[PDB]
Amino acid sequence: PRFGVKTEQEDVLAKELEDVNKWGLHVFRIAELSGNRPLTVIMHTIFQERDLLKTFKIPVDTLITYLMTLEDHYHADVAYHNNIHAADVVQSTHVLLSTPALEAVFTDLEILAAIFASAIHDVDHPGVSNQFLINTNSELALMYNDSSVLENHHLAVGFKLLQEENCDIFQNLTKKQRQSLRKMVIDIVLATDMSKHMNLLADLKTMVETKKVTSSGVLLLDNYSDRIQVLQNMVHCADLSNPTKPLQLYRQWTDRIMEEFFRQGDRERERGMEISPMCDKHNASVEKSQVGFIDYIVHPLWETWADLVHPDAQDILDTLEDNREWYQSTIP
Amino acid sequence: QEDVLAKELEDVNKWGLHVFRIAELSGNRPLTVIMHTIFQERDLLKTFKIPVDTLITYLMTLEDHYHADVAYHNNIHAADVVQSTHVLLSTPALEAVFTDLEILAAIFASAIHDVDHPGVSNQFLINTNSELALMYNDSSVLENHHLAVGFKLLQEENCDIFQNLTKKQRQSLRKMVIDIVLATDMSKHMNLLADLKTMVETKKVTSSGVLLLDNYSDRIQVLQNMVHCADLSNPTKPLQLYRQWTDRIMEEFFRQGDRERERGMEISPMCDKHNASVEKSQVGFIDYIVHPLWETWADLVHPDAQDILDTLEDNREWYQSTIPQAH
Numbered sequence A: 001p002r003f004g005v006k007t008e009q010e011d012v013l014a015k016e017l018e019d020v021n022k023w024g025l026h027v028f029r030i031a032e033l034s035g036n037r038p039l040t041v042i043m044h045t046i047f048q049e050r051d052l053l054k055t056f057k058i059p060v061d062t063l064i065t066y067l068m069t070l071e072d073h074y075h076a077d078v079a080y081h082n083n084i085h086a087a088d089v090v091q092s093t094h095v096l097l098s099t100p101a102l103e104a105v106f107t108d109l110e111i112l113a114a115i116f117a118s119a120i121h122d123v124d125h126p127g128v129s130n131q132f133l134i135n136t137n138s139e140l141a142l143m144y145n146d147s148s149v150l151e152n153h154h155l156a157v158g159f160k161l162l163q164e165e166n167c168d169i170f171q172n173l174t175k176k177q178r179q180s181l182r183k184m185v186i187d188i189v190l191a192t193d194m195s196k197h198m199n200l201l202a203d204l205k206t207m208v209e210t211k212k213v214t215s216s217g218v219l220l221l222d223n224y225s226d227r228i229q230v231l232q233n234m235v236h237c238a239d240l241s242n243p244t245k246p247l248q249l250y251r252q253w254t255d256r257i258m259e260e261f262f263r264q265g266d267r268e269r270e271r272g273m274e275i276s277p278m279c280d281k282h283n284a285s286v287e288k289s290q291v292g293f294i295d296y297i298v299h300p301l302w303e304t305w306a307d308l309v310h311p312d313a314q315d316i317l318d319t320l321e322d323n324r325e326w327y328q329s330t331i332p
Numbered sequence B: 001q002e003d004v005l006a007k008e009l010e011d012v013n014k015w016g017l018h019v020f021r022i023a024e025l026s027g028n029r030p031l032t033v034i035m036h037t038i039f040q041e042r043d044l045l046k047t048f049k050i051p052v053d054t055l056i057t058y059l060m061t062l063e064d065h066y067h068a069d070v071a072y073h074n075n076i077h078a079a080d081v082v083q084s085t086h087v088l089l090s091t092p093a094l095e096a097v098f099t100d101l102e103i104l105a106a107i108f109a110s111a112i113h114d115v116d117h118p119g120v121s122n123q124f125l126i127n128t129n130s131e132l133a134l135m136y137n138d139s140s141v142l143e144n145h146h147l148a149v150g151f152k153l154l155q156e157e158n159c160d161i162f163q164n165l166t167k168k169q170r171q172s173l174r175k176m177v178i179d180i181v182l183a184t185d186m187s188k189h190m191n192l193l194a195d196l197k198t199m200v201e202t203k204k205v206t207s208s209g210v211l212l213l214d215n216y217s218d219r220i221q222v223l224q225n226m227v228h229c230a231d232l233s234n235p236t237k238p239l240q241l242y243r244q245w246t247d248r249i250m251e252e253f254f255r256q257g258d259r260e261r262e263r264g265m266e267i268s269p270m271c272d273k274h275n276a277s278v279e280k281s282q283v284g285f286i287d288y289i290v291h292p293l294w295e296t297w298a299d300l301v302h303p304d305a306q307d308i309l310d311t312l313e314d315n316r317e318w319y320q321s322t323i324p325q326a327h
């Protein structure tokens, strides 16, 4: 099939996929047009556009088989942490990687690692937080000793699915390419644990203070530490990009995260536990909480990214400020 | 003979307990016997309302999950690390420093710290694409697994020894045990040592000469290094014990090297039965790992550990004495 899956009209899906290189791709429409296969469709498109199948000798049927299997392990009944979110983070990383300040900085293997990490970074998410898994003595928290419980699990699942029949998209990488990619993917997905956000941002501010740049604004990264730190922060920014998107996308993302949070709070309430912050549907201030989220997490991060790639992210920052105003203006 | 076993257990508060003798006399139950003795000695059953039958049931199932056919990383090693931690906890420089819950965490951590060890290193598990390294993303693979198994066994029938701890105590113990067992990963050794050296530099002592450890970070750092020292204590023991430990670790390493050889892999250092010297390997282990750590522990608690450091230095001089050297 043209776009990796069957669709009732590829012509509409093709028109939408022309925005795969743009911030604010219509990812919910892509999900509908692809029969709920946005992750497979978007990954297929990106791998073809970046010529990654030829570079890494990835058979296209192997790519599609792995992507379908991976997409199937995102839960259909989780409102936010599902295959649409995975597709969104993939596509947002794909746009961030093309930013002019990063031209020719990353190798094809680093690009592959960032995209693959984005695709697997929330797989098999149960719709509850690490702290909920710890507080309820879950098997997952027992397995992972309360540390980056979900993020360790997403990695283990995403790598394990490579072992299924006709799913090993890395079969033609060399042994050291495989080792390098595995290390980068682990480093990137572990950095999506929000318990690491403050340290990650503090370190990113330090890199920005000492950035080295060519005449035309292209960053000069010196070693693995520099490269992986930019990739970690890139995928973290993509994971935290909802409020920087066109407002209709952001509004839907907010509706979905609140649905998932409220379902967690209901589980907490039913077990007599303290309800987690922003998970009480009976005592919620959705609009206020979005403004607080932007003020304390999203704008500090994106203003630092925008500094790193100046001026590449100026419109993203401007959209963030407009979207902050939307939620401020709709506080009851 | 239960008579001789009680005599051997008389030395449970001394460095150099004959743990191999206790293993034989107890019917291969050194971990159960030594944990029970130490829990009685420290009055831990009464402090934490641990039913004695619950303790024995948990300890027997924990001991069952150390592998008999692993020559070094088995229940005797667990029992040795427990008893060594038990001695280090009573060092005069740390008198009345640690709470009973901190003491319980350090001893429990020692007891579980190598459970279900397969007899191969983290690097081997990573390099062979093992399921354990896949589960744990190549990071403290075995130590994460030891923790998960040791805690999981608390769920077995009549095995929850922490059942009468408060919720808060249980959460604190769990955190402390995780922090301690993860610090036994040798890839963290240089960072642990660099930080311990700096803690020694700036250490604070009471009048009485006892260390002052104000917050959790300083307290847990001392417990981490203290169990790491116990894990690395074999060369500080009397030569007749140290020789037995050296035999066991080389058997285990050589079996890993045989698997690497069968697989066409580069044999890990010190794992080639054909091209390795015991003496050079032990002198190197002492010079580059064990003595740098123990001289720093000895600095922290000076002069409490001088006899331990004296034995270590004697054993190093002993094992280097048959290696030809320029004079």
Ligand SMILES: COc1ccc(/C(C)=N/OCCC(=O)N2CCOCC2)cc1OC1CCCC1
Residues within 6 Å of the ligand: A129, A192, A193, A194, A195, A239, A240, A242, A243, A253, A254, A257, A258, A261, A278, A289, A290, A293
């Ligand atoms: C559109 O609104 C939101 C979108 C996403 C999120 C996040 C970050 N949710 O975190 C849950 C998963 C999580 O913990 N992660 C994954 C991302 O990076 C950090 C680690 C939060 C949102 O708004 C929240 C804050 C105000 C009340 C609802």
Ligand SMILES: COc1ccc(/C(C)=N/OCCC(=O)N2CCOCC2)cc1OC1CCCC1
Residues within 6 Å of the ligand: B186, B234, B235, B245, B246, B249, B250, B253, B270, B281, B282, B284, B285, B288, B289
């Ligand atoms: C009774 O003997 C031993 C007990 C325990 C261990 C441990 C914890 N080994 O961890 C491997 C790292 C290691 O040993 N290194 C790496 C850096 O250079 C020095 C050597 C090692 C023991 O002796 C080993 C070394 C001598 C031959 C067998």
Ligand SMILES: [Mg+2]
Residues within 6 Å of the ligand: none
């Ligand atoms: Mg190129």
Ligand SMILES: [Mg+2]
Residues within 6 Å of the ligand: A121, A122, A150, A192, A193
């Ligand atoms: Mg996540």
Ligand SMILES: [Mg+2]
Residues within 6 Å of the ligand: A171, A172
């Ligand atoms: Mg091939």
Ligand SMILES: [Mg+2]
Residues within 6 Å of the ligand: A212, A220, A221, A222, A223, A226
């Ligand atoms: Mg640099």
Ligand SMILES: [Mg+2]
Residues within 6 Å of the ligand: A283
């Ligand atoms: Mg009220």
Ligand SMILES: [Mg+2]
Residues within 6 Å of the ligand: B113, B114, B142, B184, B185
């Ligand atoms: Mg160990």
Ligand SMILES: [Mg+2]
Residues within 6 Å of the ligand: B243, B247
């Ligand atoms: Mg001998």
Ligand SMILES: [Mg+2]
Residues within 6 Å of the ligand: B287, B291, B292
């Ligand atoms: Mg020295």
Ligand SMILES: [Zn+2]
Residues within 6 Å of the ligand: A085, A089, A121, A122, A239
């Ligand atoms: Zn995510």
Ligand SMILES: [Zn+2]
Residues within 6 Å of the ligand: B077, B081, B113, B114, B184, B231
């Ligand atoms: Zn050990």
